[PDB]
């Protein structure tokens, strides 16, 4: 049985969207050669299909960003007071000093990350609004408990909410109230430890790296002659007549079409993967931030208490808060207790052995109590249980019967 | 003179021996905003990246639309946090979208609801 | 798009194979024929790839649907915001052309009321914590009520359990806990 308990925190990085892109077909394959366009008019549907696919990918990116964040339609506001029972919530709250409401850890996280028809579109939800959503979520999960995920937002003091969640994971409230200072100090130390650790993100950067590599390979592919006589169309047309230059022209055309097809297929597959990741992120946001999760090992290793979302460039970062046991102690135990030829089983807990006496205690934190009739219920005799121990169950009524 | 993409980026004029820079001028897709032909026909045109009631937006230059200073939940997204609508005769307006209302919570260390 | 792609000559001299063969001999028409063949092959390859990707997406959606069917219709879900917004009570599947439609039934709270509260209760120098609920304030008296629906009760020993003295809790209120046994002790 454990005797002490720590509180840890853990990060978890998830991509949400990649860089929206668009590649005009004709401007890439051809330059300004009119006859090049005339030849491409034999392949007409291809350019339309490619543009449609790219637009689909762009709108999918925006849909991901929309789904993962806007879970609330009532922007809340943290009170000016910071009376949260000693929980120094200052590294994740917005600061009025900076123009944007980006908090300290978001600001630190945001800095670690660093022609021919290749227009890049911007997302229709700027980073400041994303930080606004994140701040609203923080305010909701700090003040209003978790009822704000179901209908309106209901106010409740923070200490009582932490007691609620401690009851949730299977330990009585008194454990929390008896150790507010210790819990608050451990939480603050953990927050500082994370602040230090992040001061020195592969999953959020390899996406940008792969995008850069793909675009670079697409651009550099222009140089190759694709088995023709030379690269530039202008040189070919200026040096040969159409009846003999058309073969070189259409060979180049086939080369460019193959390159675009390959790049589009790669983009589609990467977008599918990113959508899967974004759906996982939405599920984590709706099942960790709001409410509590009994799904073991989902919202951070160990038992789960709460969470705190944070923003990131093209990403999202969670700060889980996990109850974790500590130093334990050996004990002896036996399931049943025989008192008057009848069994006795605990209502909640087990029968640990002092080595001389017997006790009933919580399942996850050593709290010895006296075995009364208010902790056990009886069923059947003592002649059927596989293991049992003789003892006596004190009764509350007898001393009062005087 | 080249770049990371090994494409021409600068050139020296071989009579005055001075440095010149280069830049393409062929960006921009054309897009149009319509409140629905079911009601009225007035539309506005949006260019993608060029610089231009010609009103300027972070994501292109907007023509045929009237800027406002209000903020609401928005109907037709455009880009860079700009949204168009039809409520106003009546015309087409653009503005910065509002994520929603805002209500403070009376959180006190002894008050419960 | 696949059907209409047949019309294009794919850079050949004409579309219909019959016209080409009837107007040219094989030794010179084979180039046009195989150019058309390459065009049709490219079109089929593109369409097949698009179909494969769309099918993968549809399979993902169908697996999500199966999970929702097995975790909402049968039993109850504690996964917040999975089976409909708000708390969940039941569900009712319905069919649809190439689809499925659920009718979730969700409990949702309503009008509230301000109250005053304090975690612990001190009676005889010893603490008191609720078994289930919180200690709302009448403004004159104290009560214990359910966590999600206002039901005032009288604070007895059948709603609270004791642990430790009154000298360690951060916040507490003086009051008296009625006992059921004393009036019956007559
Ligand atoms: C090529 O010829 C031009 C002719 O104008 C030269 O331009 C001279 O530029 C200097 C710069 O101040 C002037 O003072 C002269 O009056 C210009 N003309 C001449 C005839 O010198 C230019 O310098 C010449 N190129 C080089 C490399 O010297
Ligand atoms: C538990 O651990 C903390 C720090 O690790 C220590 O201060 C405390 O004395 C230990 N024991 C109890 C009962 O809290
Ligand atoms: C929170 O911690 C920071 C430094 O870690 C300190 O400057 C600040 O005063 C603390 N606030 C509270 C309320 O403890
Ligand atoms: C049993 O518990 C009592 C206190 O309840 C303690 O005094 C005694 O030493 C314990 N017996 C052991 C540790 O063997
Ligand atoms: C428990 O008490 C009964 C009553 O006599 C006795 O028969 C039994 O042997 C005791 N248990 C053990 C393990 O001796
Ligand atoms: C829009 O279409 C509906 C379809 O019946 C029609 O009744 C309605 O009049 C149309 N809107 C206007 C402004 O005419
Ligand atoms: C658009 O480009 C022109 C070109 O010089 C520049 O003068 C103008 O300031 C640019 N627009 C904005 C909003 O910066
Ligand atoms: C609760 O907040 C009020 C604010 O005026 C303060 O006076 C009081 O001491 C606080 N009580 C606790 C237990 O924090
Ligand atoms: C306290 O509750 C009683 C009924 O139990 C009621 O008569 C009285 O008005 C209440 N006190 C208030 C509302 O201040
Ligand atoms: C509760 O009663 C004790 C008993 O005398 C008293 O010392 C204490 O001050 C009371 N509580 C308050 C808040 O006055």
Residue numbers in the entry:
A (entry chain B): 714 to 827, 855 to 940, 945 to 1146
B (entry chain A): 566 to 617, 641 to 676, 689 to 713
C (entry chain A): 961 to 1146
List sentences quoted exactly from the publication behind this structure:
The SARS-CoV-2 spike glycoprotein is the major surface antigen of the virus. Its function is to bind the host receptor ACE2 and mediate the subsequent membrane fusion required for cell entry. Recently emerging variants of SARS-CoV-2 have acquired other substitutions in the spike including a number located at the monomer-monomer interfaces, at the receptor-binding site, and near the furin-cleavage site.
The spike from the Alpha variant is more stable against disruption upon binding ACE2 receptor than all other spikes studied. This feature is linked to the acquisition of a more basic substitution at the S1-S2 furin site (also observed for the variants of concern Delta, Kappa, and Omicron) which allows for near-complete cleavage. First, examination of the 2D class averages of ACE2-bound Alpha spike with its furin site intact reveals that all spikes in this dataset are present as trimers. This is the first cleaved SARS-CoV-2 spike protein in complex with ACE2 we have observed to remain fully trimeric upon receptor binding. A substantial proportion of all other spike/ACE2 complexes are dissociated into monomers. We also observed that the Alpha variant spike is almost fully cleaved into S1 and S2, which was not observed for the Wuhan spike. We have shown that the almost fully cleaved Alpha spike is more stable as a receptor-bound trimer than the Wuhan or Beta spikes which are subject to less efficient cleavage.
